Amino acid sequence: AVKYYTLEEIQKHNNSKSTWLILHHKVYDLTKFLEEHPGGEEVLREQAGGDATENFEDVGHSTDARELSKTFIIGELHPDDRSKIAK
Ligand code: HEM
Ligand SMILES: [Ca+2]
Ligand SMILES: [Ca+2]
Numbered sequence: 001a002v003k004y005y006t007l008e009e010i011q012k013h014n015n016s017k018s019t020w021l022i023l024h025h026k027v028y029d030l031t032k033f034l035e036e037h038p039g040g041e042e043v044l045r046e047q048a049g050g051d052a053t054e055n056f057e058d059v060g061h062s063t064d065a066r067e068l069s070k071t072f073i074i075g076e077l078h079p080d081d082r083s084k085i086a087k
Contacts, residue, residue: 003075007084010077014049020074022051025087028072051085 005020005027013020019031021044030037034044039059047055061069077085 004078005075006078007081011049019044019048021047021049022077022085023053023056023069025077025082025085026073027075027077028069029074030072033072053086 010020010022010027012018013029013031017031018029019034020027020029022028030044030048034041037044043055044052056069
């Protein structure tokens with residue numbers, strides 16, 4: 001039962017009212033979480049509305065962090081956009 005969002009739509013969620021990003025083709029709503037994120041707000045704000053896979057993977061987030069991330073998944077990138085965005 002995967003819920004899809006287009007890249008066009010995701011790009012709209014780029015601000016303090018609603019911040020989404022993409023990690024490995026999934027869509028995360030970090031609007032609230034970014035106020036708590038141990039890595040700070042601005043790394044996430046810079047990524048809002050787009051893919052942040054590379055950045056996320058480079059840090060070496062802990063297994064508890066990676067598990068926490070799953071709680072913010074709201075859907076996945078629409079199939080029509082999956083050539084634009086690397087998994
Ligand atoms: C939903 C996704 C995310 C969650 C739940 C999350 C969670 C956390 C947590 C709990 C830590 C503390 C260390 C650890 O446990 O690994 C952390 C640190 C960090 N995160 Fe994230 N993170 C997320 C996304 C990101 C993204 C997308 C970026 C980059 C654009 C990022 C950059 C950082 C950095 C730079 C730090 C290390 C801060 C330091 O101690 O210097 N995080 N994150
Ligand atoms: Ca805070
Ligand atoms: Ca703030």
